Design a binder for this molecule. Structure first.
Ligand SMILES: Nc1ncnc2c1ncn2[C@@H]1O[C@H](CO)[C@H](O)[C@H]1O
Ligand SMILES: Nc1ncnc2c1ncn2[C@@H]1O[C@H](CO)[C@H](O)[C@H]1O
Ligand SMILES: Nc1ncnc2c1ncn2[C@@H]1O[C@H](CO)[C@H](O)[C@H]1O
Ligand SMILES: Nc1ncnc2c1ncn2[C@@H]1O[C@H](CO)[C@H](O)[C@H]1O
Ligand SMILES: Nc1ncnc2c1ncn2[C@@H]1O[C@H](CO)[C@H](O)[C@H]1O
Ligand SMILES: Nc1ncnc2c1ncn2[C@@H]1O[C@H](CO)[C@H](O)[C@H]1O
Lengths: 233, 232, 234, 232, 234, 233
């Protein structure tokens, strides 16, 4: 076991899906995985393991913010043999042509955090996803008849920002969605030699009907799961 | 109800104790509060309200990291009439003479986060606690016969830091405990107009690697008793 | 005409290939393009326009460094209707498993320049390429039986840096190659709403080949870039 | 004798009061000290040692700016056995409710200087005072029936700043007084291992432009009396 | 030979004049130098060596931007024994009293580049020229009946900057002209122990002339630079 | 009068020499000026005015550090009609070929202070002296048979620096001397439209006989005074 995960090697699959909400992780396990079992509950951060179409897969929450998800992704990679991390969350949109319920894939992630500068000697480290994982997700989406936008996300440290002018800047440079973790996870993946990807559904435009929104969230999860199978080939 | 808390004005007391672990909040409600009731569980971040010596009080977790606690403390202050926030967490020691189980009070908090530079035009904002709340905690401690050091804490963004040399700098400048929220909470209290204090129990030693419920009991009692003193 | 390009709207195709060495531009025009015509000579930065399998294509050098390529890419985008920019150059490697003559594609580009911080209020802007262009290049390379690595490049402001320690850091974070323009071009592309991609061939390992081997590798990179454009049109 | 002070170990008391103005140091020695003797005058920076209620005490100016006071406080600490430094200066107010003659105690000090970033690996060091010394001053104040606010001060490098908008940010974050030494003194105390506190008297108002010897008397008495309390 | 200069020790004089535009190098060699001979052609950056009133002098372009000129000046200094570098180019003005075609000498150079901070542990390095070279140029200009202004230049990384507000700041602090290399060359000179100077003619005012007037002004700048070298030899 | 100077317009000459030590200002006035009178004593920062070979000249201390000298130079320029400021002080040497008692002239000044970044939008402002003043001083020195080095000075915020490695950096980039004011004064001169120059004598090598040292300090003052007369022509 590690400081934040009370499990043992083998308890997790080599691929982990990670929503921010622990209750969302349980929702994913019950809805999409067969023969699922809980493998962690420390601090209430529920994690599970089961199978999808015969493939062993895990899902665990990572909390809100770069500092939080950095702890969990690091531990999974160095102590549980995890090779791939796929964040599945929500984001706010800044571009007008980006519509509610669009599926966004973060090929890269900008940020106002200092963690990567601390890692890269105060220079600019381009926090990017793994190319093959991005490709698998785009292909899985197409196979499901879904339109997926591929571009830059912005990982913010402050959900309630005092600098409102930074949103015009994000829009000017084409940022597709605003969330709070991608840049941190990509930094961890580079530091410890693993692979990561972040996929989001637009929840607000910096909301339609519950039925349609819930349908889109499920499509995102399907895209994640099916992208893994493609990668296996 | 706010984006991360499903409750209404009046559900929380005007003072809230906050550990990072939501499970410890539950433990605190069950162990120290009278007629405790759950007032939130969105994202599993348990919150409770009850009484201590007839005084109404709430306890809710805030998660790990400045970004996480900044969301909860802000919502409590602007939409639930909360006036005082007391963080009751754990930390890692860096000084030779600081032992496990020691209780530290952060009058100030250093950090490697950029949040305060963003608020303060890229200059140095001294993230400090409310003086009266600090004094209240020191006195409570004495009345309970429990020792407690007052000084600077260090709020880190990376629990697993790639810069190990920075611990020598922390030690050199007298950092009492390494945690991940103080500087953030102090920044929010200043921006949104409330008062705050962070108290911690050394649960691990960064140099020796020693590791430790119930261990936080002295800290928890100091926090609760300090509120009573503040009311007078 | 612009301050550095003496031409008019229409003289350039909507896609432009750009090597660092100006002399490579005329070579590409005569070796790979049909019915080529000269469209620029200011400061000796020769530009050409012709067709590749019926597709309109232009080629012109960009000079060494972020400040230089930033001028040319900006003018092409805002005044000549250019939609895509493909830089084709060389780089130096720090990873042991990356070999001389290897072809690398920069999906992202790190840098020690201050240009993007100036654009992004002093925060971290992830300088990235257009995803489809990246995928097009990968597929074109595979069709030519060539294996290409996709990852991060590092755009240095100083070819002769006083900080040797930085190369260890680049290796630790998986940087595939070191050059001097990618992050600058990606910033311009985001600023003015266009698309860009950087392809490089490993010319040296920061830590030999025949003159004929180098031309073979260079010609391979150009074929990849050109065929990648056609796939993108599909 | 050090590079900027011509005296020997024993000439200064273990506690030293320090105004920026050397002429005010002289005024303090003549007005509040018993059998005061001059122990330095290099560069005109007057220093004196005498007694207050039988207690040995020194008072010496430190000049204007963080670079100036960093030299004097360092030399006193490393070569004259000085253990406590109490700055007794003036400041400009930025908040509407802070009036001229008000006494402020800086538990913390913000700054636009780079000195602390140079000491702290370019991160945020919370420049804070010694808790006990702060408490001593608050109590002394009460015993004398004088009001005093406890909070953050701002130590500026430029008295004539080209960025007037920064005053709005200072006000927004509750800065009690604008001066030029606090953050520097607190950094030196931490680096060289001593204790410090800065007390100030609002002598001008940055917004209203109002301007004010003898005006610093309440402050001076609070400082001297706080030392006595500290000795017990 | 170095990575960007195919020549050997001795091919270059100990003093080198450098324009940004490579084409200006051949012009200077044929218009002002005697018995000139070609010494470099790599990447089309032509270099020449000859004599001016018996004094050995070389001329070669440096390209646009700090990263480009930093490569050439570094190699000339460490591998070809060059002792002095004189950049001769154009700049844009922000001060109302500074006129088109005015000759300005940069005793110092401000910048928005990060190169000197990388060299100076993130502190402020005052990028300055060699004092005697500055005085030599001033005296040479006066002897030619030309009035020259001496002050600060500003070396920009982005010709097309997204921050228009910065020009007001430059005007407030007395910046004489805006170009893109001075601060980079001054940094290299300090790093490897050599001397440098930048002379520019105002080609535009950030806020016209005949083609003949421009050649007259350009030729005036070269005469000043060349005569300044001879005064320096005294 | 101003906040730190209790005098009136006319009390100062349009050229002011400024040592760091107020007692040094009095020493300069008594030694080199005729019919000198004290024109300020606020906070003990003595200032004087008299004449040198018939030329009206003033001399006043500026205290130690950039924050201190910035206050005084600013007030002199905006409220007393001062056109030129000449700092006359001491510095520590980092270069081996730079010898004790050498006279150094700061054409430029590097610094670890943030004041100029605050002024220049966080960019690099090259803090330089006025060219004509530098020239006048070099010529005045030559006329006195003195060798004067012209180059970069380094204005430090901390006399007792915690970063000892920065001295190797200063030496590598050719800094001639280390002091604590030049960069601040040059910044003030640029902000308010005046002219400034800093001249120093090497006091230590990061000391010979008192007689020879005192002789060199006086040569520096002579250079300053005579450079003014040359400028008048
Ligand atoms: N408008 C917004 N700003 C910042 N983060 C936003 C956001 N909308 C959604 N998120 C994501 O939701 C969580 C924080 O509430 C996740 O932590 C975050 O990724
Ligand atoms: N050695 C250490 N370094 C950093 N944070 C530590 C710590 N010891 C305890 N904490 C606190 O515990 C949580 C992170 O595990 C809380 O998020 C954090 O405040
Ligand atoms: N080892 C290296 N470091 C930096 N740039 C290198 C390089 N090897 C190749 N390049 C590319 O070649 C030009 C600079 O010489 C181009 O400007 C640059 O992209
Ligand atoms: N409005 C203000 N801004 C800055 N410093 C002020 C001030 N009012 C008083 N001080 C203090 O007085 C000296 C500077 O004149 C001391 O150096 C300084 O601490
Ligand atoms: N207005 C301006 N802004 C920036 N650089 C300018 C300029 N006017 C002239 N230059 C000089 O010309 C080249 C860049 O076009 C040289 O590279 C540059 O020195
Ligand atoms: N070694 C050194 N480091 C920094 N400043 C030095 C110095 N040697 C001399 N100075 C100058 O002397 C005064 C500070 O004591 C002046 O304030 C300063 O200019």
């Amino acid at each position: 076991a590690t400081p934040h995960i009370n499990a043992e090697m083998g308890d997790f699959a080599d691929v982990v899906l990670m929503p921010g909400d622990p209750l969302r992780a349980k929702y994913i396990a019950e809805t999409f995985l067969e023969d699922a079992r809980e493998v962690n509950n420390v601090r209430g951060m529920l994690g599970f393991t089961g199978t999808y179409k015969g493939r062993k897969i895990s899902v665990m929450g990572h909390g809100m913010g770069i500092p939080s998800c950095s702890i969990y992704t690091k531990e999974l990679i160095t102590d549980f043999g995890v090779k791939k991390i796929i964040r599945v969350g929500s984001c706010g949109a800044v571009l007008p042509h980006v519509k509610l319920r669009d599926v966004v894939i973060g090929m890269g992630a900008c940020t106002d955090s200092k963690v990567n500068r601390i890692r890269f000697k105060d220079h600019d480290f381009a926090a990017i996803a793994d190319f093959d994982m991005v490709r698998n997700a785009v292909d899985a989406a197409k196979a499901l008849g879904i339109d997926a936008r591929v571009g830059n996300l912005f990982s913010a440290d402050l959900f309630y920002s005092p600098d409102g002018e930074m949103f015009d800047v994000m829009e000017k440079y084409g940022i597709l969605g605003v969330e709070m973790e991608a840049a941190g996870i990509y930094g961890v993946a580079a530091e410890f030699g693993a692979k990561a990807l972040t996929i989001c559904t637009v929840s607000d435009h910096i909301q339609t009907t519950a039925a349609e929104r819930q349908t889109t969230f499920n499509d995102m999860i399907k895209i994640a799961l099916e992208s893994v199978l493609l990668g296996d080939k």
